[PDB]
Amino acid sequence: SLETPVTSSPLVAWYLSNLPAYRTAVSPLLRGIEVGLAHGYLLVGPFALTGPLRNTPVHGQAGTLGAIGLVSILSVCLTMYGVASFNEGEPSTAPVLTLTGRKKEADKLQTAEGWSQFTGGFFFGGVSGAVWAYFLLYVLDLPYFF
Amino acid sequence: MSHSVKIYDTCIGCTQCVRACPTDVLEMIPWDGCKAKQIASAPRTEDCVGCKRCESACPTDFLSVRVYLGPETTRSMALSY
Amino acid sequence: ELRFPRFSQGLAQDPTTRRIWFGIATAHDFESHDDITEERLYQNIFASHFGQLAIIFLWTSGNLFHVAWQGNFESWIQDPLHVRPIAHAIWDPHFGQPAVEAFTRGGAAGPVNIAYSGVYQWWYTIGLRTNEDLYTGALFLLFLSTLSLIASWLHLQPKWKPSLSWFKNAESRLNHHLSGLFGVSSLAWTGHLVHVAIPASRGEYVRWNNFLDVLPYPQGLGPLLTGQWNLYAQNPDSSNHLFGTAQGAGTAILTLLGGFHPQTQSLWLTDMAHHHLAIAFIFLIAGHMYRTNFGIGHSIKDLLEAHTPPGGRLGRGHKGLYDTINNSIHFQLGLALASLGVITSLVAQHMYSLPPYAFIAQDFTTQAALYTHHQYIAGFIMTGAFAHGAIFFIRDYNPEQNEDNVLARMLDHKEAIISHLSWASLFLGFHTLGLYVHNDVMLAFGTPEKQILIEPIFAQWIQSAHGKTTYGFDILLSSTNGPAFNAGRSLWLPGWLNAVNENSNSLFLTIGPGDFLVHHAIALGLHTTTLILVKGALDARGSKLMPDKKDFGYSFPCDGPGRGGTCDISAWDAFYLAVFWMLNTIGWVTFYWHWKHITLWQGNVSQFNESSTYLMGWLRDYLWLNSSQLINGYNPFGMNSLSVWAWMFLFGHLVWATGFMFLISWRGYWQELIETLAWAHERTPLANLIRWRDKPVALSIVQARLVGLAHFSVGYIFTYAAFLIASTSGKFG
Amino acid sequence: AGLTPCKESKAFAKREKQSVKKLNSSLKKYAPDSAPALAIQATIDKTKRRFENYGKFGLLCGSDGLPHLIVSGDQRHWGEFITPGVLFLYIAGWIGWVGRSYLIAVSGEKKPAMREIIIDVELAARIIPRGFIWPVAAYRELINGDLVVDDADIGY
Amino acid sequence: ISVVIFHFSWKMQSDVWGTISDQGVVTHITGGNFAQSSITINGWLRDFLWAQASQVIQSYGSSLSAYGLFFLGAH
Amino acid sequence: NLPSIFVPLVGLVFPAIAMTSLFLYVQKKK
Amino acid sequence: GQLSIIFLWLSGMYFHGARFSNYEAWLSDPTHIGPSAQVVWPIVGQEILNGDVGGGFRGIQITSGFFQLWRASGI
Ligand code: CLA
Ligand SMILES: CC1=C(/C=C/C(C)=C/C=C/C(C)=C/C=C/C=C(C)/C=C/C=C(C)/C=C/C2=C(C)CCCC2(C)C)C(C)(C)CCC1
Ligand SMILES: CC1=C(/C=C/C(C)=C/C=C/C(C)=C\C=C\C=C(C)\C=C\C=C(C)\C=C\C2=C(C)CCCC2(C)C)C(C)(C)CCC1
Ligand code: SF4
Ligand code: SF4
C-alpha cells in the first residue's frame, strides 16, 4: 500500500486503534457486547420511522421488533462465519507484528473459541442496545425529532 | 500438469514457441530428427497459464506444440491476490 | 475429492469460487464423474429416473389438493361458462387493501388466482364430480410418489441392483414397453372411460363403492363374447344432450360419430373410448415382434444387417448400427428427444382444433395458455435432440465399427448437407422478407392494391380434400361422386363434415394471403434453426479450422486468438446460437396462433386478413393495440386484477435486458474489475477482518454464455406469457 | 378459389373511388393552375389508369378489393408468376454464367488475386455477351461433364 | 444520452409547450402528467412510449409516412 | 389461518436453514 | 479536405433554400407555415411525401431550423 494522510496520521491511527474491534488486548466477550450495543441502538430509528407502520400508533413497537430480528439474523450470519472459517483447535490468524516490529500476541478474536465468544457478546448487546433505544424514545422522549 | 502441454514430432526446432512463453514453461533440448537438430520441450507445465500464444507461433502443417486446458490452480488461474 | 463436489477431484482443489459454480452444473453428467464405471452409470440413471417420477406424482398431488381445498370445483360444475376456475388462494403480507379487494373474485372470500391450466375441464370430463373425489385423488398420487422414492433407494443396495446385461436387453424391453406400457394402459383407460366417465356424463355416479352392481351396457359382457359387437354402438347420445344429466342420454358405449358434442364443443365421449380401445390392440399385437426367451420373433440385430441395398448406394447400409446405438446412451437419448419433440408439437396442434375436454373451447384464455405452452416445450426438447446428437459424435462414436455404414457417410458428405441447408434458408430469407418490405412500402405510399398477395392455394386445395366448401374446388370428400366420399358417407362424414364447415370452431380455419406469408416465415425458422444444429453436429468431430476438435470434448471455451481467432467454435456453441433461433421461431408461431384466434373470437376476422400482410400491421394492430388493458394494471389512479400481469410484464423486460450484459461484455473486462475490488477490501479498516474463504473470480467464458442465455430465455418467456394471458383474459374474448 | 375478377369486384371499384376522392380532396386547396395542381392531377390520372390495367389483365380480386396472385401454375394466369419467373431465371444465369467465365478466365495467371480487386474491363467486355446464350452453353457443359469437378477440391 | 433526450421531450410537452387560450389559460401538450406518471417505470411505458408513439405508428398514407417506415427500418 | 403459518415457514425459515446448511457443507474441508 | 466538405455542405443548404423552398412565403406568416426545403421527384408514388406544408407549396418539412437563421440575418 501507500502512506497517505488517510491511511496514517496520529488522529486516524488513534481513532481506529481504540475501538473494540482493534483493542487486541481485552476479552473478546466484551468486544462483542460493545459492538452489539452501538449497532443495536443505531438501527432502531429507520425501522420505526420509515417502516410500513410509521403512521400507526404501533410505530414504536414495530420498529423495535424489526431491529431485534435484524440483530438475530446477523447473529446467525456471524456464527456461520465463525464455524466455517476456524477450527476448534487451530490458533489465531491475526498478524502478530506491529508497525514498529514488536511481536505482540495474536488476537484471541481470530479464534474459534474467541469468535464464538464474540458473537455471544454481539447478540446480547444487540438486543440490549435495541431496547435501550425504545425506552428512551418513548419514555424520556421530549427533545427528539420523531 | 495443471494444464497439459504436449510437443509433437512435427516440430522443426524454430524456437518460436519458447521465446513466446510469458511465464517460462517450454525450453529447447537437442534432437536428431530435424535439420536444425533441436526440438522443443515442456518440463515446467505447472506455471502454464494457458495463454495460447505459445502455439500461435508454431508454423507447421497443423501444429507441433499443443495445449489442453485441464483443472485450474492458483497460479494457472493467474491470481495475484 | 476432499470437499464439494464429491464427484470431481479436479474441481475440488480449485480454490476460487469457480468450484462452486462448476460443482452445480456438472452434477448430473455421470460419465465425467471420477471413478465412474459402466455398471454405476446405469444404476445411477435408474435410481435418478425414479426420482423424476416422484416429482411428477408429487407435483400432480399439489394441483388436486388446492383445487379441492381452495377452489370452485363443485360450483364451477354448476355453470362452466360463468364461473372462473380457481387455482389457489393468495396470502401475501405485502398486499395493501385495494389489492385484497381486487384479487377477490371467482366467488371466493379472499384473494385467489384464476386457474388457466385447464385442469377444471379435464377432471370434469373424466368423471370427477365433487371435492371428495379430489382428496382421495391427492392421497393416492401422494402414495404413488412415496412408492417411487422407495424404489430409487431400493435399487442401489447390493442384491437389488440390475447388472449390465439387464439394461442392455434391448429386445425384452421393447416387447414390454410396446405391449405392456403403451398397450395395456390404453386398454385400461378404455375401461375407466366406459365404467366411470361415460356413466358420469349420463347422470350415473359410479365409484369404488358400487362399481360392481352397475352395468356399462344393460346386456354387458355378452355381445362381445358372441361376436355381434354391433350392439355397443346402437343408441348413442342424442343431439340434444346436457352434459351432466340424463336428457337425451343414449346407451351406446363404443361408437363412431366423429362430430362434436353440440353443447360442450368437444369430441364425443364415446369416440374417445373407442379410439383408446382400438389403439389398445395395435400395440399389444405390435408388442410380440422381438425375440426374448421363447425362440420366436425377430432379432433387431438381424433386421439392421439384412437391409443392405444392392448396388452399394448406401454402402454397407445399416450394418453395425445395432451395437453403436445399443452402447451409446447419448444416442438413445437423442432419438427419444426427437420423437418426443415432434408429438408435443403434434399435441399442441391437435388440442386447439379438436377440443377433447368439455367446455374448453369457450374458455379462450385456457386455449391460448395451453397451445402456447406446448409449443415452447416442443421447441426446447427438439433442440436437445440435436444437442445430444453432437455428444454422440464426440464421446461414444467409433469410426471403425461404423465403417461406411449409413452413419459414417453422413460424416462423409457433410459439406453437401450444410451448403444446401444454407441455400434453402437464404432463399426463404430473401423473399419472405423481400415480399414483406414490398408490401410494407406499397401501403406507406397509400396504395394497398399494389401489394403482392399470393393465394395459399395448395393448403386451400387440401382443405377442400377434407370437406371444406369455402373454396369450392370440388375434390374428394367435397364432391359427391368420389368413392372416398361414398366410403364414409354413413360412418363419420355427417359429423365430421358438419364440424369442418361450422364457422365457430377452430377446425380448419379459412386461410388467406396473410397465412401464406407467415407460413414461410415459420418455414424459414425451421431450416435456419436446423442449419445451426446440423452444422454443429457434423463438425463436432473436427473441421478445417481445428481438425482435432474431438480431443477437447463437447464444451470448451475457444481455442485462442491464433489462426485468426476461434471464438465460439465448440459444438456447445452451436447449440448456443440455436436456442436464439428457436425462441424467435416459436415466437413467430405462437404470435400467429394468438392473433388469428383473437380476431376470430371477436368475430372481426377481416382485421387479421388485411393487416397481416404488412409489418406495421403486426406492430400496430396486434402488439400496440392489444396491450392497452395490460399496461394499465396499475396507474396513479388505481389498480386492477391485471396488475400482477402488468408487473410480471415489466419483470420480463428486466431480466431479458440483463441477458445482454453477459452476452456482450466478455470476461476479461470484469476480471480486471474484480482485482481492484479485491484490493480495496483488503485495505479497508474494520473490513480486513473478514476474509473470503474462496477467492473471487469472474465467471468463466462458457458460464457467461450459459448465464446470459438463461436470462434471455426467462425474460422472453415471462414477457410473452404475461401479455398472452392478460390481453386475452382482459376481454375474455 | 372464389376470387372474383377485379374488373367485376365492387370492392375493387371502391378502393379506386376513395383514392381518387382522397387526392381530389387535397387538390381543392391550391390554385387551379399552379404547379401543385398539375402534379396532383398527374397522380390522379396515373391512379385511374393503374386500376384499369389491374381490371384488364385478368387479375382476380378477393373480398378486400385487392388483387390476388395465382402462382399455382394455372396457365390461364401465366404472366403473373410463371412468365416473370422465367424472365428472372434467364437473367440470373446470365449474371451467374458470366461471372463463372471470368474467374476461370483469370484463373490461369500469376496471381488471380490482383485481377479481381482490379477488374480487367476489356476481358470482361469480351465475356459480357457470352451470357446471352448461357442456357445453351451450360447444358452442353453438363452433358460433357465440365460443369463440375469430382474429388480435387482445395488447392487445385 | 437517450434518457436525457427522453427527459427533455416529456418535460417540455407536459410542463412548458402547448397552445394558449385567448382567455389566458394554458393547456400543455400532454396535459401536465409528467409530475405524477414519470416516477413509475410502467409510467414511462404507458404515457411516454405507448401514448406518444401513436403518431408514428399510424403515419401511413400521409406525408409523415417516411417516418413510419424508418421507425420500423431502424428496429 | 393455516396459510399465515405455512407461508412464512416456507418463505423465511425453510430458506434460512437451507442456505445456512449448504454454506457449511460447501465450505467444509477434510 | 474536412473544411472543404463543410463548405460544400453549406453551399447546398443555401442553394436548396433558394431554389426549392417556401422561404419567402414563410417570411409572411412564420407562425403557421412549416419550413420546407426539399422536394422529391414523383416516380413510384413517392410524391405522397410532398406534404401540404402550406404557403402554396409542397415538400418535405424540414426541421434543422435554417429559416430562423436566415431571418435573424435579414435575408
Ligand atoms: C459469379 C458469381 C457467383 C456464382 C456463380 C456463385 C454461385 C453459387 N453460390 Mg455464391 N456468392 C458469390 C458469388 C457467386 N456465387 C459472392 C460474391 C458471394 C458473397 C456474398 C456469395 C455468397 C454465397 C453464399 C452465402 C452461398 C452461395 C451459394 C452459391 C451456390 C448456389 C447459388 C446460390 O445460392 O447463389 C447465392 C447468391 C448470392 C449469395 C447472391 C450474391 C452473388 C452476387 C450477387 C453475384 C456476384 C457476381 C460477380 C460480382 C459479377 C462478376 C462480373 C465480372 C465480369 C466482373 C452456387 C454454387 C450458396 C450455396 O452454397 O449453395 C450450394 C450459399 O449458401 N454463394
Ligand atoms: C443429430 C444427430 C442425431 C439426431 C438426429 C435427429 C434429432 C433427427 C430428427 C429428425 C426429425 C425431427 C425427423 C422428422 C421426421 C418426420 C417425418 C419422417 C414425417 C413423416 C410424415 C409422414 C410420413 C406423413 C404421412 C401422411 C401424410 C402425408 C398425411 C396423411 C397421413 C399420412 C400418415 C399418410 C442422432 C441422435 C441420431 C445422432 C446422430 C446425429
Ligand atoms: C414447376 C413449377 C413449380 C415447381 C418447381 C419445382 C418443384 C422445382 C424443383 C426444382 C429442383 C428440384 C431443382 C434441382 C436442382 C438441382 C441442381 C443440382 C441444380 C443445379 C444448377 C446448377 C449447377 C447451375 C449452375 C450454374 C449455371 C448453369 C448458371 C449460373 C452459374 C452456375 C455455374 C451456378 C412451382 C410449384 C414452384 C410453381 C409452378 C411451376
Ligand atoms: S499457454 Fe502460455 S504459459 Fe502455457 S505454454 Fe503456452 S505460452 Fe506458455
Ligand atoms: S514453435 Fe513449433 S516448430 Fe517452433 S520450436 Fe516450437 S514447437 Fe517447434
From C498, C361, C524, C511, select the one nearest C436 (Cα to Cα): C524
CA of A2 to the centre of ligand 5 (A): 44
Q: Where are the alpha helices (DSSP H) in A1-146?
A: 10-15, 28-42, 44-50, 59-85, 112-137
Q: Is C126 in the pocket of ligand 2 (CB under 6 A)?
A: no
Q: Are G50 and G59 in contact (CB under 8 A)?
A: yes
- Tell me how many degrees the CA angle C433-C456-C464 measures, rounded to the nearest 5: 160
Query: Quick one: which atom of ligand 1 is closest to the CA of D97?
Result: 5
Q: Which ligand is nearest to the CA of C574?
A: 2
From chain C, pick out residues whose CB is under 8 angstroms from the CB of G44. Answer: 445
Burial class (CB in 10 A: 0-12, 13-18, 19+), B5: buried
Q: Residues of B within the annotated binding site for [4Fe-4S] cluster?
A: 11, 14, 17, 21, 48, 51, 54, 58
- What is C140-181 written as a DSSP string? HHHHHHHHHHHHHHHTTSTTSS--HHHHT-HHHHHHHIIIII
**End-to-end Cα, chain B, rounded Å:** 22
Rounded to an integer, what distance in angstroms lies between the CA atom of residue C504 and that of residue C506? 7
Residue E20's DSSP bridge partners are: E26
Give the residue on A whose Cα is nearest the Cα of F23: A80
Rounded to an integer, what distance in angstroms lies between the CA atom of residue B73 and that of residue C15? 7
Helix axes C18-25, C701-731, angle to 10 degrees: 60
Give the H/E segment covering residue C353. Answer: helix C329-353
Q: Does D51 touch chain C (CB under 8 A)?
A: yes
Task: Indicate yes or no: CB of G60 within 8 angstroms of CB of E65.
Answer: no
CA contacts within 13 A on the Cβ side of C543: 14
Give the residue on D whose Cα is nearest the Cα of G39: D36
Chain breaks in chain D (C to N over 2.5 A) after: none
Q: Where are the alpha helices (DSSP H) in C37-84?
A: 38-67, 73-78
Query: Grid coordinates 464464538 are at which residue?
Result: A116
From chain G, pick out residues whose CB is under 8 angstroms from the CB of C446. Answer: 45, 48
Burial class (CB in 10 A: 0-12, 13-18, 19+), C112: buried
- Fill in the amino acid letter for C139: L
Give the H/E segment covering residue C112. Answer: strand C112-114
Give the H/E segment covering residue B5. Answer: strand B4-7
Q: Which residues contact C198 (CB under 8 A, 6 or more apart)?
A: C216, C253, C269, C270, C273
Q: Where are the alpha helices (DSSP H) in C612-700?
A: 615-618, 625-626, 643-664, 667-683
From chain D, pick out residues whose CB is under 8 angstroms from the CB of C454. Answer: 68-69, 71
Q: Are C356 and C333 in contact (CB under 8 A)?
A: no
Q: Does D113 touch chain C (CB under 8 A)?
A: no
The 3 state secondary structure assigned to C502-519 is CCCCCCCCCCCHHHHHHH
Task: At C246, list the grid cell.
Answer: 340424463
Q: Is C78 in the pocket of ligand 1 (CB under 6 A)?
A: no
Q: Which residues contact D46 (CB under 8 A, 6 or more apart)?
A: none
- What is C266-281 written as a DSSP string? B--HHHHHHHHHHHHH
Q: Can you say how many angstroms the Cα of residue C112 is from the centroid of all Cα atoms in its chain?
A: 28
CA contacts within 13 A on the Cβ side of C447: 21
Q: Are C344 and C351 in contact (CB under 8 A)?
A: no
Per DSSP, A105 falls in state P
| Atom 1, ligand 1: residue with shortest CA distance | D99
Task: At C357, list the grid cell.
Answer: 375436454
Closest Cα in chain A, distance from residue F22 (Å): 11
Rounded to an integer, what distance in angstroms lies between the CA atom of residue C733 and that of residue C368? 11
Task: Indicate yes or no: CB of G51 within 8 angstroms of CB of E62.
Answer: yes
Rounded to an integer, what distance in angstroms lies between the CA atom of residue C474 and that of residue C110? 58
Give the H/E segment covering residue E20. Answer: strand E19-20
- Report CA-CA distances (Å) from A14 to A9, A19, A103, C688, G18: 8, 9, 20, 18, 79
From A41, A42, A89, A47, select the one nearest A66 (Cα to Cα): A47
Interface test mutation site (partner F, options C2, C4, C11, C88, max chain F beta carbons within 10 A): C4
How many Cβ pairs closer than 8 A exist between chain B and C?
47
CA contacts within 13 A on the Cβ side of C189: 19
From chain C, pick out residues whose CB is under 8 angstroms from the CB of E46. Answer: 631-632, 635
Task: At E73, list the grid cell.
Answer: 427500418
- Fill in the amino acid letter for C272: M
Q: Are C580 and C525 in contact (CB under 8 A)?
A: no
Rounded to an integer, what distance in angstroms lies between the CA atom of residue C422 and that of residue C532? 10
Q: Does E46 touch chain C (CB under 8 A)?
A: yes
Q: Is C423 in the pocket of ligand 1 (CB under 6 A)?
A: yes
Q: Is D23 in the pocket of ligand 1 (CB under 6 A)?
A: no
Rounded to an integer, what distance in angstroms lies between the CA atom of residue B1 and that of residue B46? 6
- Fill in the amino acid letter for E62: S
From chain C, pick out residues whose CB is under 8 angstroms from the CB of A85. Answer: 691, 693
- Fill in the amino acid letter for C357: Y
Rounded to an integer, what distance in angstroms lies between the CA atom of residue C101 and that of residue C346? 41
Q: Does C20 touch chain F (CB under 8 A)?
A: yes
Give the H/E segment covering residue B28. Answer: strand B27-30
Q: Does C426 touch chain D (CB under 8 A)?
A: no
Rounded to an integer, what distance in angstroms lies between the CA atom of residue C571 and that of residue C391? 9
Give the residue on C whose Cα is nearest the Cα of D151: C413
CA of B26 to the centre of ligand 4 (A): 8
CA contacts within 13 A on the Cβ side of B39: 12
Peptide bond preceding D32: is omega within 30 degrees of 0, i.e. cis?
no
Query: Grid coordinates 360442450 are at which residue?
Result: C264
| Domain range summary for chain B, segments of one domain joined by + | 1-81
Rounded to an integer, what distance in angstroms lies between the CA atom of residue C79 and that of residue C410? 58
Residue positions counted in chain C:
733
Other beta carbons less than 10 A from residue C705's beta carbon: 22
Task: Indicate yes or no: CB of D71 within 8 angstroms of CB of C610.
Answer: no
- Fill in the amino acid letter for C602: Q
Other beta carbons less than 10 A from residue C293's beta carbon: 6
Chain breaks in chain B (C to N over 2.5 A) after: none
Please name the method used to determine this structure: cryo-EM
Rounded to an integer, what distance in angstroms lies between the CA atom of residue D10 and that of residue C717? 45
Helix axes C643-664, C701-731, angle to 10 degrees: 160
Other beta carbons less than 10 A from residue D8's beta carbon: 11
Closest Cα in chain G, distance from residue D30 (Å): 6
Task: At C163, list the grid cell.
Answer: 447388472
Pocket mutation for ligand 5, best pick of B8, B12, B15 (most atoms within 8 Å of C-beta): B12
- Report CA-CA distances (Å) from C28 to C7, C161, C193, C522, C580: 10, 20, 40, 35, 25
**End-to-end Cα, chain A, rounded Å:** 44
Residue B5's DSSP bridge partners are: B67
Rounded to an integer, what distance in angstroms lies between the CA atom of residue C672 and that of residue A84? 29
Rounded to an integer, what distance in angstroms lies between the CA atom of residue C685 and that of residue C688? 6
Task: At D33, list the grid cell.
Answer: 393552375
Task: At C304, list the grid cell.
Answer: 439392421
- What is chain D written as a DSSP string? ---EETTT-TTHHHHHHHHHHHHHHHHTTS-TTSHHHHHHHHHHHHHHHHHHHHTTTT-EE-TTS-EEB-TT--TTS-TTTHHHHHHHHHHHHHHHHHHHHHHHHHHSSS-TTHHHHTT-TTTTTTTGGGGGSHHHHHHHHHHHT-S--SS--S--
CA dihedral D13, D14, D17, D20 (to 10 degrees): -100
Phi-psi region of D153 (alpha: psi -120 to 50; beta: other; left: phi over 0): alpha
Q: Which residues contact D134 (CB under 8 A, 6 or more apart)?
A: D93, D94, D96, D97, D98
Query: Grid coordinates 457434423 are at which residue?
Result: C538
Interface test mutation site (partner A, options C689, C693, C694, max chain A beta carbons within 10 A): C689
Helix axes A28-42, A112-137, angle to 10 degrees: 30
Closest Cα in chain E, distance from residue C640 (Å): 14
Rounded to an integer, what distance in angstroms lies between the CA atom of residue C382 and that of residue C341? 5
Q: Where are the alpha helices (DSSP H) in C404-492?
A: 406-409, 414-444, 457-465, 483-486
The 3 state secondary structure assigned to C198-248 is HHHCCCCCCCCCCCCCCCCCCCCCCHHHHCCHHHCCCCCCCCCCCCCCCCC
Rounded to an integer, what distance in angstroms lies between the CA atom of residue C641 and that of residue C99? 8
Q: Is B67 in the pocket of ligand 5 (CB under 6 A)?
A: no
Q: Which residues contact C183 (CB under 8 A, 6 or more apart)?
A: C280, C283, C284, C286, C287
**C-contacting residues in B 35-54 (Cβ below 8 Å):** 51-53
Phi-psi region of C494 (alpha: psi -120 to 50; beta: other; left: phi over 0): alpha
Q: Which ligand is nearest to the CA of D126?
A: 1
Task: At C678, list the grid cell.
Answer: 479485491
Buried b (16+ CB within 10 A) or exposed e, C196-228: bbbbbbbeeebeeeeeeeeebbeeeeeeeeeee
Rounded to an integer, what distance in angstroms lies between the CA atom of residue C348 and that of residue C382? 14
Question: What is the resolution in angstroms?
Answer: 4.5
- Report CA-CA distances (Å) from C593 to A72, C519, C522, D32, G40: 54, 11, 12, 52, 41
Q: Does E69 touch chain C (CB under 8 A)?
A: yes
Q: Which residues contact C431 (CB under 8 A, 6 or more apart)?
A: C520
Rounded to an integer, what distance in angstroms lies between the CA atom of residue C553 and that of residue C545? 16
Strands G36-38 and E26-27: unpaired
Rounded to an integer, what distance in angstroms lies between the CA atom of residue F23 and that of residue A122? 22
Q: Which ligand is nearest to the CA of C345?
A: 2
Helix axes C513-538, C364-391, angle to 10 degrees: 30
From D72, D51, D67, select the one nearest C461 (Cα to Cα): D72
